[PDB]
Design a protein around this ligand. Structure first.
Ligand code: M4Y
Lengths: 242, 28
């Protein structure tokens, strides 16, 4: 569930998180008993927000940004600590990304997209645009999102996922089609069938922009489209962004 | 250090300790 009460987590949300733990973990009660109130827990360093020399090539900056996102850790607690309203003006979402870097808690895919925009607004030669995926596995549908990027005419991605190959892509793909097809193949290898892809517009580098992120400029039904039309729609989206 | 900063500090330590355990469980 999503924490709605800000930080520090309020008592009711905090207790609800631990109730969830006790339900789904085999030991459950012993997990909480060993952690809650413990006086000798590891001190986790606040990860350093990466900053860049003007001489650092953008792709190397992107490695550092992704490393920062990874260091926060995938959120496995069951409680999302930051509420994200996707229609919020960019300036409000950037205040959120700033809070994420200050409080430094675990995150998942949507939070990492917001964070990835915030950490690349200093790179005007980089374009950023969200890519969402809907997949099917074992009778269920799953949703995922990453931050597509374009540098010097080549495509990559930043993000957070449980799988290495469903988040970070160095910007080396010659076309948007090839980037998305790489995600499709990565999904295939973990037995997910890709059903839909939704691609947004390029995001302003002004963190005080009042405009909204445009999340679903192109919505592609992979099965209905077939291979060639799928390719064609992706190249059209890439032109729409150019 | 304020009471509110103390709470966030204590909570963050328990969140990461829990995340380690829940991370170990999800691959099982
Ligand atoms: C938003 C979730 C996240 O951060 O990552 C997972 C996603 O990487 C997976 C595990 C791929 C399969 C899809 C999901 C379980 C949806 C949840 C996202």
């Amino acid at each position: 569930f999503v924490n709605r009460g800000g930080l520090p987590v309020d008592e009711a949300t905090w207790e609800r998180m631990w109730k969830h733990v006790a339900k789904i973990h085999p030991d459950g009660e012993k997990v909480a008993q060993r952690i809650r109130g413990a006086t000798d827990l590891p001190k986790i360093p606040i990860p350093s927000v990466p900053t860049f020399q003007p001489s650092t090539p953008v792709p190397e900056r992107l490695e550092a940004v992704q490393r920062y996102i990874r260091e926060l850790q995938y959120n496995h607690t069951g409680t999302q600590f930051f509420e994200i309203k996707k229609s919020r003006p960019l300036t409000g979402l950037m205040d959120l990304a700033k809070e994420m870097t200050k409080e430094a808690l675990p995150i998942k895919c949507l939070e990492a997209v917001i964070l990835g925009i915030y950490l690349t607004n200093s790179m005007p030669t980089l374009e950023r645009f969200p890519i969402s995926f809907k997949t099917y596995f074992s009778g269920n549908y799953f949703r995922h999102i990453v931050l597509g990027v374009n540098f010097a005419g080549r495509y990559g991605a930043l993000g957070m996922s449980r799988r290495e190959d469903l988040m970070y892509k160095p910007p080396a793909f010659r076309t948007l089609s090839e980037l998305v097809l790489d995600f499709e193949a990565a999904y295939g290898r973990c037995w997910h069938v890709l059903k839909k892809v939704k691609l947004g517009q390029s995001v302003s580098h002004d963190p005080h922009s009042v405009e909204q992120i445009e999340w679903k400029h192109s919505v592609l039904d992979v099965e209905r489209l077939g291979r060639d039309d799928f390719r064609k729609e992706l190249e059209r989206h890439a032109r729409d962004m150019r | 250090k304020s009471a509110q900063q103390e709470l966030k500090q204590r909570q963050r330590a328990e969140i990461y300790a829990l995340n380690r355990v829940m991370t170990e469980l999800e691959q099982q």
